[PDB]
């Protein structure tokens with residue numbers, strides 16, 4: 410019902426699989442989204458002072474159209490750029506975060522800004538900014554059963570079982586979606602301005618889907634497509650429960666199966682994300698970017714093959 414925030418100690422932090430099982434035992438999955446604040450001692454990496462030359466092969470210009478909190482988003486591929494150029498562009502007068510009193514103010518401006526000036530999103534960059542020295546909660550090495558996909562079938566899907574980086578700027582958005590194969594996801598905000606998340610509890614996913622079909626007749630399973638934006642007001646107006654949580658630098662966000670989510674970046678930032686699985690996911694996977702469930706059912710549910 411409500412988004413939980415967890416504050417693990419280092420000892421609690423060590424094993425990812427175990428801690429996610431713990432989060433679920435406390436009901437975290439019910440809201441569709443949980444925040445995890447790492448222990449004070451922990452770092453993803455020592456310094457981020459060597460990233461200006463990182464290549465953004467295909468920055469995406471995000472064009473919105475629509476009215477009254479209901480928008481379609483379209484992505485135009487732009488020419489390659491480096492992170493340094495991208496950062497400068499993000500902080501330029503044309504693209505910078507507008508002045509705001511607080512979050513509520515900024516959120517209202519975000520929703521009121523559509524269609525408006527299309528931002529550029531450095532999304533879907535194959536890569537990681539975690540160091541190998543980081544042995545807890547390293548998005549390249551979570552060690553969940555999702556590793557069976559590569560290990561048993563040799564299947565590599567970038568961004569699903571390998572990490573993606575997202576360099577964002579004001580107003581860049583992720584439209585409503587669930588993850589491929591109804592997998593979990595984890596998102597770590599390395600640095601920069603916040604990222605605001607909206608989530609609809611899994612219990613109410615089907616209601617969101619119905620509302621979406623009504624709101625986007627021409628387009629209508631089109632949500633996993635990541636193209637529909639629906640404002641909080643429109644959700645409230647149609648009686649869809651949702652939660653809103655802002656993620657700040659140094660914080661993790663975990664999304665759970667059947668948890669629809671959407672959001673936006675406040676300003677220049679850098680996030681890293683990957684999907685993962687648990688034994689609980691397998692039956693979602695059975696019902697569900699597609700891949701075979703064979704290795705999972707065979708190895709994790711030998712009883713039930």
Ligand SMILES: O=C(O)c1ccnc(C(=O)O)c1
Pocket residue numbers: 532575582583588594596604670680
């Ligand atoms: O763009 C993002 O930050 C984001 C957030 C949540 N999910 C996705 C996704 O592609 O699954 C992307």
Ligand code: NI
Pocket residue numbers: 586587588594664670
């Ligand atoms: Ni997602």
